Amino acid sequence: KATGTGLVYVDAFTRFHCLWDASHPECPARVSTVMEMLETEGLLGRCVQVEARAVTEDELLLVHTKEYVELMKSTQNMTEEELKTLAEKYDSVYLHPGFFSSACLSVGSVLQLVDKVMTSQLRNGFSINRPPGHHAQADKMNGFCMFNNLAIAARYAQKRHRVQRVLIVDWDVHHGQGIQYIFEEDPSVLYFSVHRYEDGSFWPHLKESDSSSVGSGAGQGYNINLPWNKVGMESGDYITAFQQLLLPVAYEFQPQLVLVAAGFDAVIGDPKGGMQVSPECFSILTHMLKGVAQGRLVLALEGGYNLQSTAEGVCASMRSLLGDPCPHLPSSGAPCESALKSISKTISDLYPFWKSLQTF
Numbered sequence: 001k002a003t004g005t006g007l008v009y010v011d012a013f014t015r016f017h018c019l020w021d022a023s024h025p026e027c028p029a030r031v032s033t034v035m036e037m038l039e040t041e042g043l044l045g046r047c048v049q050v051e052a053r054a055v056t057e058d059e060l061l062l063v064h065t066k067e068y069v070e071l072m073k074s075t076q077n078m079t080e081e082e083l084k085t086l087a088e089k090y091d092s093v094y095l096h097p098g099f100f101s102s103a104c105l106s107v108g109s110v111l112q113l114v115d116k117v118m119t120s121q122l123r124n125g126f127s128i129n130r131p132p133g134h135h136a137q138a139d140k141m142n143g144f145c146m147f148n149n150l151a152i153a154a155r156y157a158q159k160r161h162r163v164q165r166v167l168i169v170d171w172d173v174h175h176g177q178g179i180q181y182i183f184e185e186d187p188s189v190l191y192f193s194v195h196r197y198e199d200g201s202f203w204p205h206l207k208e209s210d211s212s213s214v215g216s217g218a219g220q221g222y223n224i225n226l227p228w229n230k231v232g233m234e235s236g237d238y239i240t241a242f243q244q245l246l247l248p249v250a251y252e253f254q255p256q257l258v259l260v261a262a263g264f265d266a267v268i269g270d271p272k273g274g275m276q277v278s279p280e281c282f283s284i285l286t287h288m289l290k291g292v293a294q295g296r297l298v299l300a301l302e303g304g305y306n307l308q309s310t311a312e313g314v315c316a317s318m319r320s321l322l323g324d325p326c327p328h329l330p331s332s333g334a335p336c337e338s339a340l341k342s343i344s345k346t347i348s349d350l351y352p353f354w355k356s357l358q359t360f
């Protein structure tokens with residue numbers, strides 16, 4: 001049997017930042033603070049250190065267009081004004097001369113963990129990477145992302161490791177619309193995102209972030225959006241969503257690999273997410289996901305902007321990956337009415353496609 005929890009972190013993840021705002025939320029301190037807490041908590045030393053690698057062109061082209069890859073590669077040589085001009089053509093993006101290099105190692109870090117997990121060298125793993133990936137699209141940056149780390153990893157697992165079915169779970173407080181678009185017509189990848197939505201008033205402000213977007217073509221039924229329409233959701237809301245919606249579908253889908261867009265902007269204290277999820281909740285969510293795919297689970301960091309809250313969320317997830325007993329949840333409680341309304345609506349939209357959801 002596979003044993004061990006992999007961790008990838010390289011100093012290159014700190015070597016890019018916003019050139020026009022020294023206080024930009026997507027900053028090197030996000031990942032260095034995580035690493036400092038993993039060490040203080042004694043968790044870092046229990047992990048198997050896994051080297052990062054740079055993604056190749058062929059791997060990027062599993063998801064991205066050649067023209068976009070070439071444009072991103074060219075940012076290495078642009079001036080600060082050239083970088084600002086290009087970044088402002090995208091939605092919520094900054095650029096930096098080291099962004100491309102770091103983005104290539106960010107992708108490659110996930111591919112390394114996929115290698116170790118799919119060949120049973122490790123049970124599971126976590127990349128402590130930036131830049132994030134889940135908003136990046138075939139031919140554009142978006143939302144602090146250049147390359148779609150997990151979408152590339154999913155297609156890489158299929159091509160290199162002969163995986164038939166991949167589940168991608170996006171618990172970052174934002175909708176990973178890039179992942180949705182990439183796998184829209186693909187029944188071999190099931191994408192589930194829970195995200196703040198507020199009827200479109202919360203970024204990215206897309207109608208396709210609602211639960212009516214279920215996939216298309218052969219992929220119909222394999223895209224599952226759970227939008228929250230009120231702020232302040234707690235652990236009981238996320239636990240209910242996983243138990244009543246995600247896990248029934250996951251056990252029916254029978255994935256061979258689970259990839260997690262592991263953002264921590266839904267954690268208590270995040271300045272953007274507006275949710276009240278205890279970090280300890282992520283130990284429970286991680287635990288639930290270990291039950292499918294024979295525990296083959298790879299997490300990659302997405303968002304999360306309160307340095308302490310994000311570090312605590314990573315630590316809680318890591319404790320589960322390492323096999324530590326699940327925590328007692330402090331502010332635990334039944335789901336609220338608004339969460340039940342959203343869960344019910346998504347179930348009603350996905351009901352025709354999944355027999356496990358037909359409990360009424």
Ligand SMILES: CC(/C=C/C(=O)NO)=C\[C@@H](C)C(=O)c1ccc(N(C)C)cc1
Nearest residue numbers: 092143144172174203263265302303304
């Ligand atoms: C993209 C994103 C988070 C993504 C994430 O977490 N993906 O999962 C947040 C946006 C709304 C944001 O907060 C922002 C802040 C400042 C800014 N400028 C100063 C121009 C532009 C955008």
Ligand SMILES: [Cl-]
Nearest residue numbers: 084087094095
């Ligand atoms: Cl910029």
Ligand SMILES: [Cl-]
Nearest residue numbers: 115116119121
């Ligand atoms: Cl290997």
Ligand SMILES: [Cl-]
Nearest residue numbers: 123290294295
């Ligand atoms: Cl396990």
Ligand SMILES: [Cl-]
Nearest residue numbers: 235278331332
């Ligand atoms: Cl709680």
Ligand SMILES: [Cl-]
Nearest residue numbers: 335336337338
């Ligand atoms: Cl309520």
Ligand code: NA
Nearest residue numbers: 170172174194
């Ligand atoms: Na999400």
Ligand code: NA
Nearest residue numbers: 183186189222
């Ligand atoms: Na799909």
Ligand SMILES: [Zn+2]
Nearest residue numbers: 172174263303
């Ligand atoms: Zn986010």
